Structure formats: structure tokens, C-alpha cells
Ligand binder design. Structure first.
Ligand SMILES: CCCCC/C=C/C/C=C/CCCCCCCC(=O)O[C@H](COC(=O)CCCCCCCCCCCCCCC)COP(=O)([O-])OCC[N+](C)(C)C
Ligand SMILES: CCCCC/C=C/C/C=C/CCCCCCCC(=O)O[C@H](COC(=O)CCCCCCCCCCCCCCC)COP(=O)([O-])OCC[N+](C)(C)C
Ligand SMILES: CC(C)[C@@H](C)/C=C/[C@@H](C)[C@H]1CC[C@H]2C3=CC=C4C[C@@H](O)CC[C@]4(C)[C@H]3CC[C@]12C
Ligand SMILES: CC(C)[C@@H](C)/C=C/[C@@H](C)[C@H]1CC[C@H]2C3=CC=C4C[C@@H](O)CC[C@]4(C)[C@H]3CC[C@]12C
Ligand SMILES: CC(C)[C@@H](C)/C=C/[C@@H](C)[C@H]1CC[C@H]2C3=CC=C4C[C@@H](O)CC[C@]4(C)[C@H]3CC[C@]12C
Ligand SMILES: CC(C)[C@@H](C)/C=C/[C@@H](C)[C@H]1CC[C@H]2C3=CC=C4C[C@@H](O)CC[C@]4(C)[C@H]3CC[C@]12C
Ligand SMILES: Clc1ccc(CO[C@H](Cn2ccnc2)c2ccc(Cl)cc2Cl)cc1
Ligand SMILES: Clc1ccc(CO[C@H](Cn2ccnc2)c2ccc(Cl)cc2Cl)cc1
Lengths: 602, 602
């Protein structure tokens, strides 16, 4: 694994540094020994191809570093050579240690301002504790060393240079955790912008502005917006400001800023939706257009589920064509064949409801399947904010409807099976629309967070209790007459009875007209204590405990689900239903831009 | 919508200011350009009829404003002209910007101290972030600018002037959010009162004192009471104070201060009921008169419900007059007709209970219907503090009793229907009286806050689960013999069974003497996990979470419901039962006033 490899790399590196007297002296700064070694081979390299000057820079030894450079000035030009540290110069190290005196002394000797630390130890990854990109300028920037940043830009640091992710120094500052200084650095770098560096995309296509949204960097987002706003007037406690929406609303771009924020996997990204140009924009879009269209679509879907349900209630059945010879058989009706299922006026009235039913299942797949391939199947089905679990069950619903159509046409028996799944999944998919309503929306997120959290843990331990007790109850009744207590009469019935007895959805077996096994009363007392009293009530206790701790995040997830719904509706619906949002600049002489005006009290 | 209109107004305003070189110079303060333009048409107006001097005042440019006034002194007199800003002078703007030097310079040039900003941007509304009324003095006051307030009063600001709501500067200060400075301003304005300005009503009929109650301004209320109290004595740690009740008790006034506070829709208004002249007054009224009369009325209503119930238990029925030919029919009795329903001594004893029952339903409507028209139907039925939901069900109860009387008299069949509603609603309306008792009162507010909150959200998602599963269970059993498992034998029974199975109020279907469908055991396992375990227990978890967060407001709502009951009883009951409260001043030589004396430890 990578941790064991990095560890060896570090161990071999320290071993070489102890083995070589020149690298050893570069780490210890014993200028006596180092002068004698240099007066007496300067190319000597550690375990990763690093020079004695990289070693002096790593241990921050300016005296050893200047002796090494005075003896062999060419060392200032050298990269490290091996897979972890490829391209790392003594200048990258001196910059990361903030040694301005060593950085000057290296630049005075031709150390490259444009060198790229291409090795893995520099790549963005979960493996690496930092990500400064690849260049001395990007290091000095993320390190928060203006004096080094100016010194490098003077010496030719290309400010528009890009690393292996395509990230410029501006993209890299958006990724750093000192969000507050990163701003002062962001302004220092834009003081040399003179296409703007603000508009350069990385290889994901993200500009710095889109990256601050995607990464949830709310401090850099609100800092970037201070240069995309104009104060129209202030009068007493009131100010009117005009925000340029060109970045946030992303008109006619192939993937918008708000899509990138709502689909981001960072929990910090949802906080961007609470910021001033945005909250007001997504709130305007939702009241004016989003909620009216979502209430119409919710109503049409519920009427379509009533239509589908009615085609199940009036499903085509006839009297069985053979006798119930087994006294335990209760089936009295059978399917009509296709050639007899459409004969009466009521069958033709149903056929309209069935063709509407099938048409809705086709339309569901025509609307769903393309969005799997844009968003990505895992995000499509995994993301709570995008509706992931409802996209699974609506595709499953439409698939079970189309399977039921193929079964009808082919005279295949057993349409009850796909229709029973399609009725449960079809109606529970009406919970998709709960996200538009402040009453139902946050509660539907508790249902989801309780299903995947507490109900899953409960069902795993509930299963071993049911297997223990269903087996004990089955073998207790194995020897007794099945007609006197039917609940445990075979292992599948004993499992199902024990599951219903666990949840108290059926009454505990009892027949006072006969002597039940004494081992049953012992086993059922232990079961009612463990299953019913302790665990079924411990479920309520752990749900009540989960609920107060999740209640803040559920509201944030709901406020984000409303924005994701707003963004979905505007991307999918015909534009004539969704007029461009905000204020057109052109009819007021402001040029091609579109704006949001907000008035605030202070 | 108004937001899009205000936004255009702001955009057209800024466009004109950029288009006109004179308004542009008034905003930028480039005295070079402005001197040349004025030396070279001074009437030029922006998008809302505002002058270049309004523009200089808005951008707070005293140098541009004094050049514009020096070139054309008549500009100081000008209002703005268009619908948002009608009547707004440069003096309104200079006052709101607190520019005392510009305000003098305008007043020195005849700017009107009595101008009214009649435009909508000044009206009280949810659309407007501030409300300063219409006059320069009311602006200077709400802005908290004594030096400008004195300067205006010297120049003739009519302190008794009223805006389009009838609000004086005192009413407007009660509405402002800096409740603490507003007091220092309130005293500054009363220093010029010399009918008192304290007693002038707005167009709602509210004086400043009633408005501080209605708006829940507890800081201004307790400040107003410092001038309506007298300290009789202090001895060591004890003080005795005498509060004038003339304002709070509002004797013989058509609508009292305490009615206006308990019927207010502001959540802050209930906090007035916790203040020193009041809490002691409403507590005295409740112990001495309120609770004794409310316990008598509670007892009389419960005895009337026992009387009505007894007329239902002894309802007049006879043997059916035709055979039960359908083997699934269980009806054996039928109504007696009016001409046979009153024959025995026990029928005449009932008839007294029925005439008492009907008389109580008439009395309920005679007591209820007038109060709908005073309070207003929406407040009458909407307000928790006034008893809103109990006023709905008591009017509904009386209507179902009078309908049942019309049915009896007309020999109409089916009296079971209106009587079953009248028994449920009649007895649940006994919960109205829970508000008098500290044990039952706050709990009856949780019942209400759980019905309209958590039970509503639950019932919406519970309904789609019941529609999904009732349909799956119905079509699973559609083909099987109805006599072996009756629960899902038609769609209305399948809905009702699935509702009872959701809540575990009936046992899960099972008949071990026959092979049930395998799809039933699959569907019922999924149902018991989703309905019974997860959601029925998630109801308890979300109620437990709502309960601790609502528990403070429920106690405040209960303490306010007791005062609303006290105020109701005193307004409705015969005065001889409700002696005037407090201490008559006349028999101690204090004149016509009535007082509350409170003794306090400090
Ligand atoms: C997110 C939570 C997920 C939790 C997942 C857990 C699920 C709960 C239960 C598992 C379903 C097991 C279904 C067994 C059906 C047997 C039918 C049958 O064929 O029975 C028996 C055969 O087998 C048995 O004897 C026993 C089967 C093996 C033991 C039970 C299954 C264990 C499954 C373990 C799963 C992992 C659990 C780990 C901890 C969670 C035959 O039938 P018979 O009884 O008529 O005997 C006919 C013959 N005589 C009359 C002579 C008796
Ligand atoms: C604050 C919370 C408020 C929540 C409100 C929600 C309410 C829960 C349930 C709704 C009541 C529906 C009553 C249906 C009665 C049908 C009787 C009948 O006539 O059935 C059927 C006819 O209809 C049906 O087939 C299906 C009816 C349509 C679907 C069910 C109603 C959907 C209502 C949706 C409401 C909105 C929900 C949105 C999400 C909350 C006939 O009768 P049969 O079965 O004897 O068939 C006789 C004929 N064979 C023998 C051949 C079968
Ligand atoms: C035999 C059939 C009837 C069984 C398998 C059916 C399972 C249904 C009842 C289960 C399967 C997954 C469940 C499920 C998945 C996830 C979510 C998202 C959550 O935010 C709301 C509840 C909701 C929508 C629930 C509802 C109930 C579902 C849809
Ligand atoms: C406790 C958790 C883990 C939940 C999920 C466990 C469910 C188990 C107990 C349930 C789910 C589906 C049930 C089930 C499916 C269908 C049938 C066919 C029926 O003719 C006999 C019972 C039988 C065989 C039962 C046995 C018990 C099962 C397997
Ligand atoms: C068919 C009939 C019997 C059905 C419709 C009757 C409904 C009754 C049970 C329901 C309807 C509204 C409910 C209701 C409304 C509001 C309140 C106010 C609350 O502070 C206490 C409970 C209380 C008083 C409850 C009691 C139960 C009521 C009165
Ligand atoms: C889950 C929430 C939404 C609550 C309110 C839902 C209630 C539903 C399930 C209940 C309320 C009243 C019930 C109801 C009313 C009366 C009858 C007549 C009876 O002869 C057959 C059942 C039938 C038709 C049932 C069906 C199920 C209903 C409609
Ligand atoms: Cl789980 C679930 C999901 C969505 C709805 C949709 O609920 C709304 C009503 N509502 C309830 C609360 N706030 C709004 C609705 C019901 C019926 C029809 Cl036909 C249209 C609409 Cl818009 C109900 C349950
Ligand atoms: Cl929901 C409800 C509402 C009101 C009462 C009234 O309860 C009181 C008794 N009580 C109980 C607690 N504190 C006082 C009562 C009962 C019977 C009779 Cl006849 C008269 C009275 Cl005054 C009881 C339930």
C-alpha cells in the first residue's frame, strides 16, 4: 500500500543522508566538516535523487546551503529524480520553509522559478496532507509568503502557469484551509493579472469562481463577489446593491455554477446556496417559477398514480378453470387472456388508462436515462440533494410497468408480482415531491436518514434474534399437532411469525384448550423481554437520540434540495416557461450583463 | 410583482442619473463640471421626478448640494413626483442621511418642514424595510438624531402631524426596532407636548400606549409606565408603588387595551402580559373572579354534555319493520317516528333533556355568532390565544344538534350521522376549559401544536404508504376466496385495513389453515418494516424532538390563554359579577382614577 511505500521512501532517504558524509553535513550544519569535504564530487544524491543542497534546504541550513552553492553553483538548478519527489528543486523546499534569505541566494544562482514538482508527493490526493500544486509561486502563495511571492514574480514566476490538474495559483488558493489569508494572497496575485486569470479553467473546466462554489469555500466566494457587485446608493440605514449574475446564473454554458454546487459531494458546498447574490436568486426562481411548476408536476404525477392504481383495481380476471382439490387452496380467480381481456366497454375504458400507464413509464425512462449519463450513475443514484433513491425507485417502477405490459401481451401468468412492486414503489415515489413543501420536505429527509442509519443497524441485530428464536420456536412445535398452533408449523412460517411477534403485529401464540410445550412459555418469555420490551423500545430511544442530532443537517439538506429542484426544473423544462432571471443590463445601458438588485438594512 | 417594479424603478433612476450630466455631477461631486453646468435648466429631473438636489442629498454631497442651491434656491422646495417617491424632498433625504449641515442649508433656503413623503416607498408594508411615516420630523426621530429633531421643531415641524395611517411621531417611534433609543427620543418629543400627544389616536383608534401593547414593544410599555406610577413610600428593602390603571383597564372604552394585546398577531404582544401594572392586574382578576366563574362554566358545560349524551343513549328506536334478507345485514332496530317517539313517561323525561340540549345549541350560537363579527372571522377562528379551533367545533356541534332537531321533526332517517359527529365534537370541546387549569392547560396546547404540526406532516406521507400498500394487498387477494381472509376483499376495506395495520390497531392477516399468496408475505414484511417499525416509531421520535423545543412557548401561550379567558369573561358576563378592579382614587382624594398598588422587595 502507498503508506508503506512512502514510509520506506522516508526511511531510505534518512539512511542515505546518514551514510553520505556530505548529505550528513548538509543536515547537521557542521561547517568545519562541510568546508573540508567541499575543499577536497558535489553531484552526490540521496535516496530520491535529491542533492546535498536539497538536504541543506530541507533542514533549513542557510550556511550549509550557501557553502554548497559557493562550491558548486549548478546545484541550485537541480531537481530531485525519483517517483515521489520528481522535479522538486532546492527552491521549492526553501519556499515551503519560508527562508527568504535562502530563496534569494538560490534565485541569484539561477534556480528555476518555473520548475514543476511533478512527483506524486505533490499531487492532489487523500494520500497527501497538503496540495500546493507544482510551482515555486504556487508554493509561496499557499504558504502565505507575500514577500516570497513578489520576489518570485519579479524573477519571472509565470502567474498563469498550470499544474497536472490544470489548476492555476488562484485555483490552488481556493483549495487551501486558511480561507482568510488566501484572500489577501488572491488580491496580491490579481495585482499582476493586468483573458483574465479569474477566467482560466482547470482540466475539469472549473474557473476559480466555479471551484470556490464546488469546494464550498464560502469565504473566497463572498470575497470574489465583493468585485462583482456595485453599490447603487445608501440612504440612512438602507443600501441598494446590484450583483452581476454572469458567473452564478451561467447562461447558455454547458454546465452551470448552480448545477456544480448542488451536485458537489463536499458538505461545505451547500453553504454557498446561503450567500447574498445566490440565496436571493434561488429564492426568486423558486417562488416565481419553481414551486408553481413543481405543484403542477406533483399533481399530474399523483393523478397518473391514481390512473395506474385504477388499472390494477379493475385488472382483468375470470373464474378458475379447474377445481380447488387441495383443501388449503383459496385461489378462485385467474387471469383473462389478451384475446378475452378486451371485450366490454369497461375494458376499452381501462385500455386508455393502461396506455396512459405505459406511456408514463416510457416517458419516465426517456426523462431519467439521459440524466444518469450526464450526472454520472453513482452521483445520480447516490446524492440525497439530487434525489438519488427516488431515481432508483422511479426507474424500477417504470421497468416493472413495462415488464407487466410484456407479460400481458405474451399471456404470461403472475402479473400480481410486478404490479405489487409497481404499486408500492410507484406510490412511495410520490415522496419525491415532498421536497417542494416546507411541511413534508425535512421530514422526508428524516425518513431517508432513519432508513439508511438506524433501521439498517436495527435490522442486522433483529435478524439474528429472529433466527435464534424462530428456530427455538419451530423445534419446540415440531413434535406437536399443527392444527392447534399454526404459527411455527414449518421454518418459513416460524421465521415470518417470529418477525411479526418481534414487532407485535400479531398476537403471541396461545390456545388455552390444549397443553402447549413448557419450553414454549420459557422461550416466548425470553423473546418478549429481548425482542418486544428491550429492542423494539430501544429502537424508539435510538431514533429519538438520532433525531435531535440530525435535525440541523436535515433542514440544510432540505433548503439545498429545493435549490436542486429549482436547478433541475430550469434545465429540463421548455425555456419559454423559465424567463431569464434578474435584470437585463442592456435596456439600462450596462451592456450584455444580467444583474440581481438587493436592498438591505444595516 | 412589486419587487420587479421597485427594481426597475431603481434601474431607471440610476440610468437617468448616468444620462443627465447635471445629475451625474450631483452624484460624483466633481465641482469643476458642476460649476460649468450651473454657469452655462436647473429643473432637470431623474426617473421619479427627483431633482439634481435630491441626487446630491442622496449621495450625501454637501458641496454639490450647496452649489445647486446657490445656483437655484427654489430646488430646496421641490418634491419628487412619481408613484414610489411622491412628495419626497431633498430635506427628507438629508435628514435620513443625518447631514445636519445640509439640513440647516436646506431649511435656510425654505425647504418645507411639513412636507409629506406620500409615495409607497414610505408606507408601512411588508415590501418596505423601514417605516418612518411621512414628515422630516418623524424621519429625524426614527433616525435617532436629536440635534436634527430640535432643529426641525424650531423651524416649525408640527409635532402633532399625522401620516396616511394617522400615526403621529410617537406612534412611529413605538414601531422602530431600536426600542432603547426610541425612549430618549420619545421624551425629547414629549418635552414639546405642552389633548396630550400621548392621547392622539391613529386611524385604527390606537393611542401610542395601546400601540406599544399591540406591537409588543415591552421596552416602550415599561418606559410609558414610569410616568403612570407613584412611589408611595420606601422602607428598608420594601417599596410601595401605585400604578394608574386608566390606560390598561380601559373602563367603558369600546375596545380595551387587554383585548387589543391578547388578540394581537405579534408574538411579542404576549410579553406585555408579564409587565408590573398588568401581571398583577390580570393575576388579581383571574384568582378573584376568573377561575371561580370558569370552574362554574366548565361544570355547567360538562353537565350539559352529560345531558346531551343521555339523550343519545336513550334515543328513540323500535324493531325493524322488514326482514334481514341479505345474510350480511346486521340492522335489527330503526328510528321511531315523531308521532310514536313521545308516548311513555321516560320519553317525556327525555324530551326535557332534548329541549335543554337544543336550548344549549341556540345559546351557543347566540353567544358565538356576534363575536365572529367583532374579532373578525379569521382572528376568531385562527388565534390560539382566543380559542380559535374550539370556536369552530362548538359552532359545528350546535349546528349538528339543530340539524338533528330538524331531522327528528321531519321524520328524516339517519340521525346517527349528525349525532356521532355531535358527540365527538361536543365532548372534545370540553378541552376548551383545560385552559383554566395549570395541569391540563399547557398540555392542551401540545395537543394543538402536534395536530397542526407533526400529525399533519405524518398523515401526508402515511397516506401515500397506505395507498401503495393497500393497492398491493388488494391485488394480491383479488384472485383468492374472500371468506378465508376478509381484510383486503375490496378497495375500501383494503384501505381501511391497511390504515389499521399501519397503526397496529388490528392484527396482521393470517390463516394458517390455508395457503395465502407468497406475494402477501413479501408485501406485509416490507409494510411492517416501513409503516410499523420505521414510521410509527419515527412519529414518537419527531414528537419527542418537537416537544422539548416547543415546551417554553407552550407555557407562554398558556399564561396568555388564561389572560384572554379573564378578558373574555369580564367582557361577556354581567357587570354585577365583575366589580371594577383595583383601588378607587375618589374615596382617597386622588380624583376619578383607579389604581393598582404593588409592594416589592429590592
Ligand atoms: C439490513 C438487514 C438484513 C438482514 C438479513 C437477514 C435476514 C433474516 C433471515 C434470513 C432469511 C433466511 C431464510 C431461510 C429460509 C429457510 C427455508 C427452508 O427451506 O427451510 C428448511 C431448510 O432450511 C433450514 O432448515 C434452515 C435454513 C438455514 C438457517 C436459516 C437461514 C440463515 C440465514 C442467515 C443469514 C445471515 C444472517 C447473519 C446475521 C444478520 C426447509 O423447509 P421446512 O422448514 O419446511 O423444513 C422441511 C424439512 N423438515 C420438515 C424436516 C423440517
Ligand atoms: C392531512 C392528511 C391528508 C391525507 C389525505 C389522503 C388520503 C388517504 C387516502 C385517500 C382516500 C382515497 C379513497 C379511495 C376510495 C376508492 C373506492 C372505490 O370506489 O374503489 C374502486 C374504484 O377506485 C379504484 O379502484 C381506485 C381509486 C383511485 C385510487 C385511490 C384513491 C387515490 C386518492 C389520492 C389522494 C391524494 C394523495 C396524495 C398524497 C397524499 C371501486 O370499488 P372496489 O374496490 O369495490 O372495486 C369495484 C370494482 N372491482 C371489483 C373490479 C375492483
Ligand atoms: C415487496 C416490496 C413491496 C418491497 C420490497 C418494497 C419496498 C418499499 C416499501 C421500500 C424500498 C425502499 C424504501 C425507501 C427508500 C428510500 C426512501 C427515501 C426517503 O427519503 C423517503 C422514503 C423512501 C422512499 C423509502 C420508502 C419505502 C421503500 C420504497
Ligand atoms: C428483521 C429484518 C432483517 C427483516 C428484513 C427480516 C425479514 C424476514 C424475517 C422476512 C422478510 C420476508 C419474509 C418471508 C417472505 C415470504 C415468505 C413466503 C411465505 O409463504 C412463507 C414465509 C416467508 C418465507 C417469509 C419468511 C420471513 C421473511 C424472510
Ligand atoms: C367523524 C368524526 C368523529 C371526526 C371527523 C371527528 C374529529 C375529531 C375527533 C377531531 C377533529 C379536530 C380535532 C381537534 C381539533 C383541535 C383541537 C385543539 C387542541 O388544542 C386540542 C385538541 C382538539 C380539540 C382536537 C380534538 C379532536 C378533534 C375535535
Ligand atoms: C393516513 C391519514 C391520511 C388518514 C387521515 C387516512 C385515512 C383513511 C385511510 C381512512 C379515513 C376514513 C376511512 C374510511 C371511511 C369509511 C369507509 C366506509 C367503509 O364501509 C369501508 C371503508 C371506508 C371507505 C374507509 C377507507 C379508509 C379511510 C378513507
Ligand atoms: Cl409524501 C407526499 C408528497 C407530496 C405531497 C403533495 O402534497 C400536496 C398538498 N400538500 C401537503 C402539504 N403541503 C402541500 C398535494 C396533494 C395532492 C395533490 Cl393532487 C397535489 C398536491 Cl401539490 C403529499 C405527500
Ligand atoms: Cl379536557 C378537560 C377539560 C376540563 C376539565 C375540567 O376538570 C375539572 C377538574 N380538574 C382537573 C384538573 N384540574 C381540575 C372538572 C372536572 C369535572 C367537573 Cl364536573 C368540573 C371540573 Cl372544573 C377536565 C378535562
Amino acid at each position: 500500500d502507498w503508506e508503506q511505500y512512502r514510509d520506506r521512501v522516508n526511511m531510505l532517504q534518512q539512511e542515505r543522508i546518514r551514510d553520505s558524509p556530505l548529505l550528513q553535513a548538509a543536515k547537521e550544519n557542521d561547517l568545519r566538516l562541510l568546508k573540508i569535504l567541499l575543499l577536497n564530487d558535489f553531484q552526490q544524491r540521496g535516496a530520491v535523487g535529491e542533492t546535498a543542497l536539497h538536504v541543506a534546504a530541507l533542514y533549513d541550513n542557510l550556511e550549509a546551503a550557501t557553502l554548497l552553492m559557493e562550491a558548486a553553483p549548478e546545484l541550485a538548478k537541480e531537481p530531485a529524480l525519483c517517483e515521489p519527489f520528481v522535479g522538486q528543486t532546492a527552491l521549492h523546499i526553501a519556499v515551503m520553509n519560508q527562508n527568504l534569505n535562502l530563496v534569494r541566494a538560490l534565485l541569484a544562482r539561477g534556480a528555476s522559478v518555473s520548475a514543476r514538482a511533478t512527483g506524486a508527493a505533490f499531487r492532489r490526493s487523500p494520500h497527501n496532507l497538503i496540495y500546493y500544486g507544482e510551482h515555486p509561486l504556487s508554493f509561496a502563495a499557499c504558504v502565505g509568503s507575500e514577500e516570497i511571492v513578489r520576489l518570485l514574480i519579479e524573477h519571472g514566476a509565470d502567474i498563469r502557469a498550470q499544474d497536472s490538474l490544470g489548476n492555476t495559483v488562484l485555483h490552488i488558493l481556493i483549495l487551501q484551509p486558511n480561507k482568510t489569508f488566501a484572500c489577501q494572497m488572491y488580491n496580491l496575485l490579481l495585482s499582476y493579472d493586468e483573458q483574465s486569470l479569474e477566467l482560466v479553467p482547470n482540466h475539469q473546466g472549473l474557473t476559480p469562481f466555479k471551484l470556490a462554489g464546488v469546494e464550498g469555500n464560502t469565504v473566497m466566494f463572498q470575497h470574489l463577489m465583493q468585485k462583482r457587485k456595485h453599490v447603487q446608493w445608501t440612504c440612512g440605514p438602507l443600501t441598494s446593491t446590484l450583483y452581476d449574475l454572469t458567473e452564478i446564473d451561467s447562461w447558455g454554458e454547458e454546465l452551470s455554477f448552480l448545477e456544480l454546487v448542488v451536485s458537489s459531494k463536499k458538505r461545505e458546498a451547500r453553504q454557498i446556496l446561503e450567500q447574498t447574490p445566490v440565496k436571493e436568486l434561488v429564492s426568486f426562481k423558486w417562488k416565481k417559477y419553481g414551486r408553481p411548476y413543481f405543484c403542477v408536476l406533483a399533481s399530474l404525477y399523483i393523478l397518473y398514480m391514481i390512473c395506474f392504481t385504477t388499472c390494477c383495481i379493475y385488472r382483468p380476471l375470470k373464474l378458475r378453470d379447474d377445481n380447488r382439490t387441495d383443501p388449503r387452496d383459496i385461489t378462485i380467480l385467474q387471469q383473462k387472456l389478451l384475446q378475452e381481456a378486451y371485450v366490454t366497454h369497461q375494458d376499452n375504458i381501462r385500455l386508455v388508462g393502461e396506455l396512459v400507464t405505459v406511456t408514463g413509464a416510457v416517458i419516465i425512462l426517456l426523462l431519467e436515462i439521459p440524466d444518469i449519463f450526464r450526472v454520472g450513475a453513482s452521483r445520480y443514484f447516490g446524492q440525497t440533494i439530487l434525489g438519488g433513491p427516488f431515481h432508483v425507485i422511479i426507474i424500477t417502477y417504470a421497468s416493472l410497468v413495462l415488464l407487466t405490459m410484456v407479460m400481458r401481451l405474451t399471456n404470461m401468468n403472475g402479473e400480481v408480482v410486478p404490479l405489487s412492486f409497481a404499486l408500492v414503489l410507484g406510490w412511495c415515489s410520490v415522496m419525491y415531491f415532498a421536497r417542494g413543501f416546507q411541511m413534508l420536505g425535512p421530514f422526508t429527509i428524516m425518513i431517508q436518514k432513519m432508513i439508511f442509519g438506524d433501521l439498517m443497524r436495527f435490522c442486522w441485530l433483529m435478524a439474528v434474534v429472529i433466527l435464534g428464536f424462530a428456530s427455538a420456536f419451530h423445534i419446540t412445535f415440531q413434535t406437536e399437532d399443527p392444527n392447534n398452533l399454526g404459527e411455527f408449523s414449518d421454518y418459513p412460517t416460524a421465521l415470518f411469525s417470529t418477525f411479526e411477534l418481534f414487532l407485535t403485529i400479531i398476537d403471541g401464540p396461545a390456545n388455552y384448550s390444549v397443553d402447549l410445550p413448557f419450553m414454549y412459555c420459557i422461550t416466548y418469555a425470553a423473546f418478549a423481554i429481548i425482542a418486544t420490551l428491550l429492542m423494539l423500545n430501544l429502537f424508539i430511544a435510538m431514533m429519538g437520540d438520532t433525531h435531535w442530532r440530525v435535525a440541523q443537517e436535515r433542514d440544510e439538506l432540505w433548503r439545498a434540495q429545493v435549490v436542486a429542484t429549482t436547478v433541475m426544473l430550469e434545465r429540463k423544462m421548455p425555456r419559454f416557461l423559465w424567463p431569464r432571471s434578474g435584470i437585463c443590463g442592456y435596456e439600462y445601458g450596462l451592456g450584455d450583463r444580467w444583474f440581481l438588485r438587493v436592498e438591505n438594512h444595516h
